């Protein structure tokens, strides 16, 4: 039993809710919140901009030190950093950005990072400003992640479409 509330169960291990991931994280304080990161951990907009804003820019300060030490992430890769006031940990995961021409095939590799964590609160990778089809992202999530994932979808119309079209 965990404290995630109001989710629709899609499969044995995938759950979904129309919710603002920032408000979900603040309420639940999950062990792991996933950020929709880019390779430079520049948290300017989308989910990343919202999560970072909620940390009063502490996420960005920590991220800049991480990049200065380690260099950029790979598309499809991840790193574990602090969850600040939102979670114990933040798993920064880089899905491909279609608006940069990045290979959508890397979306499966991106979701594989979730399997290193027993339970996660997460957005749909490569959705939103990353330009992929959220229906495809949900399918890859279900077919790749084996650990327990609680998906927060900000847009109500999109959420209803994701549920109604789910196979």
Ligand X SMILES: O=C(Nc1cccc2c1[nH]c1ncnc(NN3CCCC3=O)c12)NC1CC1
Binding site for Cl ion (CB under 5 A): 46, 128-129
Could you identify the residue written with the tokens 């502490």?
Answer: 58
DSSP for 79-94, please give it: EEEE-TTT-SEEEEEE
CA pair distance 134, 153, nearest whole angstrom: 10
DSSP for 54-119, please give it: HTTTHHHHHHHHHHHHH-PPPTT-EEEEE-TTT-SEEEEEE---GGGT--TTHHHHHHHGGGGSSE
Cβ-based nearer residue to Cl ion, 46 or 95:
46
Cβ-based nearer residue to Cl ion, 45 or 72:
45
32's contact among Cl ion, ligand X, none, with CB below 5 to 8 A by partner kind, is: none
CA pair distance 139, 96, nearest whole angstrom: 15
Quick note: the x/- pattern for ligand X over 6-35, rule CB under 6 A, is --------------xxx-------------
Compute the least distance from the CB of residue 35 to Cl ion, in Å.
11
Quick note: the x/- pattern for ligand X over 87-126, rule CB under 6 A, is ------------------------------------xx--
CA pair distance 97, 131, nearest whole angstrom: 6
Compute the least distance from the CB of residue 132 to ligand X, in Å.
9
81's contact among ligand X, Cl ion, none, with CB below 5 to 8 A by partner kind, is: none
Binding site for ligand X (CB under 6 A): 20-22, 46-47, 50, 123-124, 127-128, 134, 152-155
């Amino acid at each position: 039993v965990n404290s995630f509330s109001g989710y629709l169960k899609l499969t044995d291990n995938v759950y979904i809710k129309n919710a603002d991931i920032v408000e979900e994280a603040k309420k639940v304080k999950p062990t792991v919140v996933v950020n929709a990161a880019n390779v430079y951990l520049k948290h300017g907009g989308g989910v990343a901009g919202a999560l970072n804003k909620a940390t009063n820019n502490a996420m960005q300060v920590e991220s800049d030190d991480y990049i200065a030490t380690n260099g950029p992430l790979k598309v499809g890769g991840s790193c574990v950093l602090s969850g600040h006031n939102l979670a114990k940990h933040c798993l920064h995961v880089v899905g491909p950005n279609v608006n940069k021409g990045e290979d959508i095939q890397l979306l499966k590799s991106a979701y594989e990072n979730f399997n290193q964590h027993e339970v996660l609160l997460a957005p749909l990778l490569s959705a939103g400003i990353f330009g992929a089809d959220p229906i495809h992202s949900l399918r890859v999530c279900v077919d790749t992640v084996r650990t327990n994932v609680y998906l927060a979808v900000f847009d109500k119309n999109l959420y209803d479409k994701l549920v109604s079209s789910f196979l």
